[PDB]
Design a protein around this ligand. Sequence first.
Ligand SMILES: [Mg+2]
Ligand SMILES: [Mg+2]
Lengths: 132, 149, 152, 101, 140
Amino acid sequence: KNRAARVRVAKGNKPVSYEEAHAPHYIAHRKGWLSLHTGNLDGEDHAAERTLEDVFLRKFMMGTFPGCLADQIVLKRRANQVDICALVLRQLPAHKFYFLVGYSETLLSHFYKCPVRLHLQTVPSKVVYKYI
Amino acid sequence: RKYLFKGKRLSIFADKAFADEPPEPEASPSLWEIEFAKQLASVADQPFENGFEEMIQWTKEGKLWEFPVNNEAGLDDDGSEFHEHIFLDKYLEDFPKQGPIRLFMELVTCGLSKNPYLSVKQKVEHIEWFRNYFNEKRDILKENNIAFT
Amino acid sequence: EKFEEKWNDILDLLKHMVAQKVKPNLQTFNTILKGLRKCYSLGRIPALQILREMKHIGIEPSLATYHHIIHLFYPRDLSAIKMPSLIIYDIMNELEGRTFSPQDLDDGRFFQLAMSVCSSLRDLELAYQVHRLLNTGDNRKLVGHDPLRKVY
Amino acid sequence: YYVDWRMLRDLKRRKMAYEYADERLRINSLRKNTILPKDLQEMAGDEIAALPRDSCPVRIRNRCVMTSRPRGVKRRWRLSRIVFRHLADHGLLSGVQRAIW
Amino acid sequence: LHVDVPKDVTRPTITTSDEPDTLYKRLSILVKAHDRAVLDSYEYFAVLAAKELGISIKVHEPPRKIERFTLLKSVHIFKKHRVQYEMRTLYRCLELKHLTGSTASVYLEYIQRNLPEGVAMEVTKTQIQQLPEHIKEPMW
Ligand SMILES: [Mg+2]
Ligand SMILES: [Mg+2]
């Protein structure tokens, strides 16, 4: 049996999002890619550095927004610009988000020497694709 | 009646037949002049109104790449020329004009001319290293009938 | 104690600026007008003379320079509202279509003051001219800061 | 802290080979030819041997940057097969999909 | 905006120099992406943009490349059981013609600044110039 990235069946009480529901073989078929850069295209360089930066950027956002992330973040690289698009629950006060956005942008722009912007779409609660 | 530019004036000053006779940077910018300029900018300092204005600011600050993309932007190798990189035999004058050492340095300088990853200064350092190396080995060379410097 | 002495003193500083072959700048005239806002009644004729001298010298009046003339001619605590001055109309005609850049530290103040004078006079035609000037070029950047942006 | 002591030794090997790259190039050039006297080549053969062993560039091993696994690594991403599959199977690698054909 | 509209919008300063301009006989723009639909949308934006500035453009689709590699599915042993991965690269080539150097800079900036994420460009300018003045006349 294959176990990779597969949320298993229980008794029909486990909420799963659209991203979680689909196993790896649905990548490029039903669900797209969370990161979009040019480093895995044919004849392109610096794939290892884009991949390492993404791993860190995901751990950073999880810790900086603990319990406030509704789904996995989406990373979009254009030129030297980095764009982080995160679905965030409406738990924290509004002014706290403005603090964490200013902090997380400045800190990650001085760490990777690129302009980094954070895009936050607030949801009332996690969106459930199906109950499995 | 209350014409803004029709009527008597103070007349203490006279028409500026000579204008801006002393240069604006009479001295290097002082703290007084450097700080006044920062305040003038704040007078018109308003927040970004769209993504275009934000990108314009990043461009002025060097944060965002300039377009169209130039893969060699800001990358000048000491303002050198092609002839400096390609013709490197001028630096082999100290070496023997003929013989095995000349034959070897010919191969060394041929590779250096085809090296795009080194600057002219770095290439000269490779040549200088061999000059001092053979000088130290003068006694071994003399035994083999090779005379260096 | 005496304004006439005080005014003649400030002028003496200006006369020594010509003896020493030192030419005045915009800030010099703006500083004189900002001081004159204290004496609303007696500063009217002196203030206009300065602006005429500013043009003859070749210094271009900035938004700050008008901000000071307005304060001096349209006092906020003006009991004599029966017959207000008409200078605001001439100023707006003078600046119609012109674009301005930061050249003084009171440029932002002008627009907030101009709208206030429009509300006092209850002239909506003048309010359109002031807002229309704000939209020409990049004049929007001199509307003012947080305190003066919301008042305008 | 690096992943383990094996990754730490490799990092030092990579930083000492960079310092001795020009030196080991200039000396080794004197040996890889047939134009110079064999006495000089025999002496250059020992100058290169005398350099520290960690300067030698064949002692570098490519290890997964995240788990320090010596084998199973993919050189384009610098990750082991196990670590690569975790990022790929979750949609986190840009453009990597499963191969069905 | 219904009633509140800018009056005299400020426009950048474009000063004509005295230096002669570059002349590009051809200008091939090879965009690459993992997604065909993105190339279709970008192709529409680029062809529409070229036609609006007077540039002559043609488009063709170079054959796609699929790079496949095999990995070991298990963490330990079970050699015969593998997992395979692929990366797909798709191409759209925009071949422009008869461009001056000013027209090629403004166009490339405009379309390069709007290059979607996950798309890589490969511009291949082809300049045409006279012969070197020394070569023009044989000198011994
Ligand atoms: Mg351990
Ligand atoms: Mg090995």
